[model samples]
Target: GLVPRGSHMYASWTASMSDATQVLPGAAPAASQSFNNQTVRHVLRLSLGGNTLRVKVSNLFGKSPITFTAVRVAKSTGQSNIDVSTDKSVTFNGQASVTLEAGTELVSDAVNLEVAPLTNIAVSMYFSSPTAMPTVHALGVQTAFIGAGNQTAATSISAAAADQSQSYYGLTALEVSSIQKTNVVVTFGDSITDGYKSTVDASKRYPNQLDDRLKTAGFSRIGVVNQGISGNRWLNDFSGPSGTSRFDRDVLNVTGITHAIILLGVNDLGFSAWLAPTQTVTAEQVIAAMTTAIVKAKAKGIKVFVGTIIPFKGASMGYYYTDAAEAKRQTINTFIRNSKEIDGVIDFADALKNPADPLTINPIYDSGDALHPNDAGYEAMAAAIDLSKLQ
Candidate 1:
């Protein structure tokens, strides 16, 4: 039921609340906050758009139920502004409001709005009562705005009174249904896949670039959903949930998902060597996790592709790239290149590594931290993908 026929997830982001606040140490906003009688607007850019759309909300990590008194979707005109004329109310089971119990998620009734590919759709949810806790996506890269009262259908909320954060809360997936068949690819990974250091609201992530490439290649029916979580690991839970743990929810559970491109494990190696010494994991453990993920996805009839961990030798976070960790990366990459179960390998390492020094990130692609890729770097990463494989 989660994956209804002919419907595909056009956009999705992982959810967390307090756990994400501690993902990257020393980042501002040390604790999570609750909201009451306020409207939260999230702008999601669709990789493949259509008319009949559904919005999925979650309280998966909430300790208490969350009641959204009003939920609406509209065409975004950038920066917390929406086309008021195009606004449409989103309902659940024909009701205007819906309450999500702890650890539950629900999709809204079909919304009548024609959306174009690579366009922004704004989803505004108003909480009339104090919510216990809500699922959140930290490091969303795009800006989300919060304002008082039921501003769900408002053309624009007052910028002076509205609070803005580069994070997504409560909202999960944006799905679109079509009469014709549509396929979706879930780009799964960690911070690099999460588009760290890329320009906010620009949608310059590698997955976004892949969507562009796919569209240009006349693969207009294929949707690309980015399910990357910042600081995520493969073998252990660090930022949100481990890759193995969330694979079902993020990848396999999605409707109309035909393929998955995994680029995880770097955080597992980096964090153990630097952040959490006790959680040290060998390259073999990571490969086993990858194998597990591939098997699970394949069981659901989804094509699985693994990517080599990119070069992080000279990353500014010196502890994250020690000589031993570099050796571990090499071992993991070798496994990815030769894996038998995987449908194919996306050589992200080969795509971003410096030609003169394979151990380090290419200067042109580096985001200065020498870990994540810049916009141009993301372009190269997306370009490296073999589109024919998706066919």
Candidate 2:
């Protein structure tokens, strides 16, 4: 009964993680929280909706196993509160509790819950003992409510009683089964795609905006999942595992992924220039890493698209704006644009580059950092996607 005949299942949402040990600058404390008896409520918006739903939780970067005393899902009623009327318990193999071993992910049994597309849903979990260094996706952009004891079923927690953080712990994805064929597109990349400077809790990320565009274009069957980890690299592991290392779990293993759009390698180029000036990455190396990822995705019958890295010439962080790095970005983007192996190419660079100065980000789109984009830039990135290529 996992997949009913003629019906399709897809990951309506996803949160890619960075290991707790590889802490990046400005990361949230919850990323390494050792839960004793605490309830963490993660709010995520679904790109596709259905009556049947299942939750995927992870311990992919955990140091110890975590036993969930209780797990519940409900309709989010804004700001760490859930609509109790829609609350439902999430069970595992007909049991009320489940334990996830280190470096693993487990999906809950199907629950009959009606979800509407683009609607925010809250998944609350009560973590019992021995949870050291819980798995986490650091730059959530959405607030997660952390409170003491079992509050999975709580309708609301007063601000004074709730401890808030902007990181997702353990929770990874939500899968939905629908009678309609719902295909998923995962926007894979670093900070820009992660909506680093976009308004928090507004769901203004490019993938979120792309979901909006799909719904408005009447392509309601396609779901967009954001697998962006800030500071992530295509060729190396820093804030998170390298794109090549996590592609299988973040893209191919999704319930029903039809396409993958990779907008990475900027960090592979930027980070080394800033942090480790000695470690220089060549355009060929970046392209090869991307090629490896594309081949893996294609092997799983998934179409692969690559996004040209956006401009970072005036970036304030580190020494990321070297002339050499810029040339490498251009070379890699040229390959993405002209490659026959790629199913499609999205010009994210074109979408945000200045017309007068192509090397610099359009002032309008710059998120002040000159590296990440603002909310408007995210909208432009979403608008740049050719709907025809998606089909």
Candidate 3:
């Protein structure tokens, strides 16, 4: 009886192009500039508390052709700058300014502004010249990198010169308008669910403690996306392309994903028996590539879950633990505990292994790297996740 659909909440804070750390005057040190002290603020905590707000901007990796001038959004406090006279700014495609070409991404057409619930917003962008931008995919922190005239770590534009071909920047539109009805929880993994040794602003992954336990159980309209991509794998393609070709761009183009868990085949049975040392694979070919990714997430209606795969014998990258990869990880955790094609199942390899050796891993949740899972083994894999399967 899961019924509650008007609670919008979507998040993304990436500004890539490898953080575009300053460069101009014939740029081309791999070309692409204009991004200093880079700001992509966020501090949401809403659940269904409304205030009219819309955002979505992405150039999805532009190559040439871009334009975004003095776009703004304020109301910040996680530390100074963003007052803009009591905040309330808007504009896109008709004056406030907009233009994106070469691939594409822009979706700002719902400005009324009135957000709250742990609030703290500040999405700023001020580009003038330089083309080829857009590569953001979940960036949280690490600022300071602005290049192109009128410097001072950027923020003093006049416009009109330095157009290597126009690559302005601005984005927030991964869809979120409010009156509510937005959902997503992609997680999907590799590299210990890609927090790789945690400690970056300490959100301690386990999907940031399951997004702080779904915002302390109020569910806050759920939207926790982290498409784990670190040395990923699940039957081939290797890092980046495999996870079933980025599961339709990291779990079905996010922006409202119903649900998805998938921890992924330990680098395809741990690096294909450590790079073909007389190759081997079979737990029925890793449960037929995780049952073809749970039949491609029940043909896109979403709601698919499966974790298992956590112990790596005595891991320290010992060429992909073998005892026939622990008997194909106990025949793929016994077909993911009798798969009915998954709707649930998070047995993180029997809750971080070592129950007297479920094949190894419980060295106190091994941050000792016996094969990932630290912050107390990602807090017992987010406390064996079963928030009533999100109702």
Candidate 4:
């Protein structure tokens, strides 16, 4: 580990891993949410290289104060272990520790940790207080280890790491500084963008795949961060904050943000018809919600692209597969493809739809649930994005 001079550097953000925090279903308010008197470790893979950076933490959905007895970030040995040689305790305002009030978020003071692109870094934190199931990202698609007691400063949690989980707890957004321009592209939407049902812990989410693609395509200066929430809707709240309301916090406020891709609205159409039959909506209504997102992004001078919702006509979630919903999807996709309001369009629907029958998702790509995509399906969605549009 090196020494942190300051965050005042002319640092262009090289990477940003955004928060997908949301409320877990059926988990009671009384349940110890996550990291309750527990030590947890999350491993993050960077898309680009950096020598100095900062980390972001959230109690944004906490019901009470969260005290971190210890927090540290180190180079990973690539196993379920941290490289102690590079381990450094994170501090807040020159102090070794800090506490966050309920429903708040904060960034850690700068840390000097040299790392390379695609190299995984281990971030460990210890929480001595029990939690009431504060909001979480639900699906990390990565494995995290847990141990009893304050294991944050330990060189090895091997024996103590008797258990492991795949969901990220309390930590969100890792920003790294670099000399490159680092224009970030935020893939913002719902389960599809969240990599739901993709191979667990494999980094196969569409956004992850897109990051890989961009790098391989020699577009080394662009970084992609996912702001998707499972079951997130364009008009109303569900698994996370609604897409419309979180736009500013998730997209516009992102460091080095230069562009965004919108892949929302499916839940608004699906759940409204299936779960809440009383809340009716038209294709126009859904498009209006999409426009709201476009307007906000454009105001910030960020280039925005709209993605057509993939076909879900024969979704295994039968209640939402009605012909009426199918028609609505087609209408909305048409607007996204033809609209002059967006900088460009990503035809995700066409890439994942069944050619034999355009209204349904391709069975081969379906994740059995027929709503989300399998690993191969996610790759196709990533493939649909033109690397040239990242400008």
Total colliding residue pairs, candidate 2: 0
**Residue-by-residue lDDT tens digits, candidate 1, 1-391:** 3544554444432332224434444336545557789888889888776768888888877777889899999999999999999999999999999989888888889898888888888999999998754367778989888898999999887655438878777788888766556778888888888899988999898898999999998888878888888889888766887788888888888777888999998888888666787788999888888888888888888989998999988774558888778888999999989888899999989989999998889999989988999999999999999998786
Clashes of each: 0, 0, 13, 3
- lDDT (Cα, tens digit) per residue for candidate 3, span 11-127: 432121112332222344544434443332333222222456555666655666566654556555443244555454456655665877755666665556666543445555546
Worst 10 residues of 2 by lDDT: 23-32
Per-residue lDDT of 236-269 in model 2, one digit per residue for the tens? 6776898889888888887888988889988888
Choose 3 or 4, whichever is better by TM-score. 4
Which segments of model 4 are wrong by more than 4 Å?
A: 1-34, 159-162
Instruction: Work out candidate 4's RMSD over C-alphas.
Output: 4.0
Show model 3 residue runs off by greater than 4 Å: 1-8, 11-53, 56-128, 131-173, 180-183, 190-260, 268-305, 308-328, 331-343, 346-388
**Candidate 2 residue pairs in clash (backbone atoms < 3 Å):** none
Report how far off residue 213 is in candidate 4 (Å).
Answer: 1.0
Identify the leading candidate in terms of TM-score: 2
The TM-score ranking, best first, is 2, 1, 4, 3
With a 3 Å backbone cut-off (N, CA, C), the pairs that clash in candidate 1 are: none
Q: Cα deviation of 349 in candidate 2 (Å)?
A: 0.8
Give me the runs in candidate 2 sitting further than 4 Å from their true place.
Answer: 1-5, 23-31, 159-162
Distance (Å) between predicted and true CA of 106, model 1?
A: 1.1
On lDDT, who's better, 2 or 3?
2
Q: What is the TM-score (0 to 1) of candidate 2?
A: 0.94
Scored by lDDT, the top model is: 2
